[PDB]
């Protein structure tokens, strides 16, 4: 829409109050003109037709419970755009400031959220397994990172390349969660998953086996479910990324951590310059080693730690 840029206030899924960038033109719209070609948030009104209607509000205050998932989708897409711009110098997901669109209230009781190739889509959850998925900043950044991947490496969504695709989304969703300093951790989706149970999450990067995902290449899923285990076998790479950052000893192999910042620089470089659509885990290890070599030198501690981490999860 064409209008005047302004700032409104509302409450997110978790009850926290935040300011959001909106546009005024008769109604106040969830349209943020301050980032790239804009961030637009739509109401899918419990249907599956997309994108639905651009979110319009009469007084620029978003405190209704129906408003909450829109508030956070809009606000966390703005924080993810900021992270990629300020930390990695990338303007939006295509690198040329493409507009970011998200629809909330997709379908009824839908327990998922996803990047469909053109925009973000979020379910409200059934209220037991999940609450509205846009309340999780790691979920939002995980999904928006698939858009980055689609425009750069282009990893296909199956077998080892899909598991790399998923792990890259978990890694950067986690780094965004640390950049916003939103009670940060190495788990995924703990703010929106099972409201009635405290302490769990969908997946864990520090200990993937806690929820049953493999933490070593010899434990990888080899069947056909979940497009060859994209959400299961991503635990092997998540554990390697956690070790590179934080250090530790895993199956008797010791890794000195080099921190989150270098973790992000190495993986971002591997993703945008060396990964291809059909890269496998062994090619990710080579890409990460080469990236670390470009940035820190072939005899750095950083290169050494990337090697030990992949060795610890059995990836040669
Ligand atoms: Ca209102
Ligand atoms: Ca957290
Ligand atoms: Ca998390
Ligand atoms: Ca829970
Ligand atoms: Zn994903």
How far separated are the first and last CA of the chain, in Å rounded?
52
- The rounded distance, in Å, linking the Cα atoms of 160 and 253 is 23
- The rounded distance, in Å, linking the Cα atoms of 15 and 18 is 10
Q: Are strands 100-104 and 120-122 parallel, antiparallel or unpaired?
A: parallel
Q: How far is CA 193 from the centre of its chain?
A: 15
The alpha carbon of 111 and the centre of ligand 5 are apart by a number of angstroms equal to 14
Q: Which ligand is nearest to the CA of 175?
A: 3
Q: Is 119 a catalytic residue?
A: no
Sign of CA dihedral 234, 236, 241, 246: positive
Q: Are the C-beta atoms of residues 212 and 221 closer than 8 Å to each other? A: no
- The rounded distance, in Å, linking the Cα atoms of 71 and 55 is 10
Q: Which ligand is nearest to the CA of 205?
A: 3
Resolution in A: 2.0
Q: Are the C-beta atoms of residues 267 and 168 closer than 8 Å to each other? A: yes
CATH code, 155-315: 1.10.390.10
- In sequence order, which ranges of 89-136 are alpha helices (DSSP H)? none
The alpha carbon of 178 and the centre of ligand 2 are apart by a number of angstroms equal to 8
Of these residues, 74, 143, 216, 302, which one is catalytic? Answer: 143
Provide the experimental method for this PDB entry.
X-ray
Every domain of the chain and the residues it spans: 6-154, 155-315
Q: Are the C-beta atoms of residues 238 and 312 closer than 8 Å to each other? A: no
- The rounded distance, in Å, linking the Cα atoms of 164 and 186 is 17
H or E element that contains 10: strand 4-11
Of these residues, 74, 105, 216, 231, which one is catalytic? Answer: 231
Q: Are the C-beta atoms of residues 20 and 75 closer than 8 Å to each other? A: yes
3-state secondary structure at position 139: helix
- The rounded distance, in Å, linking the Cα atoms of 217 and 185 is 24
Q: Which residues are annotated as a binding site for Ca(2+)?
A: 57, 59, 61, 138, 177, 183, 185, 187, 190, 193-194, 197, 200
Q: Is 143 a catalytic residue?
A: yes
- The rounded distance, in Å, linking the Cα atoms of 185 and 310 is 22
Q: Which CATH architecture has domain 6-154?
A: Roll (3.10)
Q: How far is CA 84 from CA 163, 176, 309, in A?
A: 22, 9, 25
Q: Which ligand is nearest to the CA of 173?
A: 3
């Amino acid at each position: 829409i064409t209008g005047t840029s302004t700032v409104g206030v509302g409450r997110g899924v978790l009850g926290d109050q935040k300011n959001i960038n909106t546009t005024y033109s008769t109604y106040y719209y969830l349209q943020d003109n301050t980032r790239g070609d804009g961030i637009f948030t739509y109401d899918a009104k419990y249907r599956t037709t997309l994108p639905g209607s651009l979110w319009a509000d009469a007084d620029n205050q978003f405190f209704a419970s129906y408003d909450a998932p829109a508030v956070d989708a809009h606000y966390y897409a703005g924080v993810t755009y900021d992270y990629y711009k300020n930390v990695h110098n990338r303007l939006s997901y295509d690198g040329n400031n493409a507009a970011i669109r998200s629809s909330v209230h997709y379908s009824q009781g839908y327990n998922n959220a996803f990047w469909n190739g053109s925009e973000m889509v979020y379910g409200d959850g059934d209220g037991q397994t999940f609450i509205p998925l846009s309340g999780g900043i790691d979920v939002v950044a995980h999904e928006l990172t698939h858009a980055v991947t689609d425009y750069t490496a282009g990893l296909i969504y199956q077998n080892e390349s899909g598991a790399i695709n998923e792990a890259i989304s978990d890694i950067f969703g986690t780094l965004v969660e640390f950049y916003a300093n939103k009670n940060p951790d190495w788990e995924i989706g703990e703010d929106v998953y099972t409201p009635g149970i405290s302490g769990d999450s969908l997946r864990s990067m520090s200990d993937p086996a806690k929820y049953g995902d493999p933490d070593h290449y010899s434990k990888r899923y080899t069947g056909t479910q979940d497009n060859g285990g994209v959400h299961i076998n991503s635990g092997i790479i998540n554990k390697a990324a956690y070790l590179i950052s934080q250090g530790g000893t895993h199956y008797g192999v010791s890794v000195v951590g080099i921190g989150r910042d270098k973790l992000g620089k190495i993986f971002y470089r591997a993703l945008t310059q060396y990964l291809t659509p059909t890269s496998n885990f062994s090619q990710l290890r080579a890409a990460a080693v080469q990236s670390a070599t470009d940035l820190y030198g072939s005899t750095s501690q950083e290169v050494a730690s990337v090697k030990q981490a992949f060795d610890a999860v059995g990836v040669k």
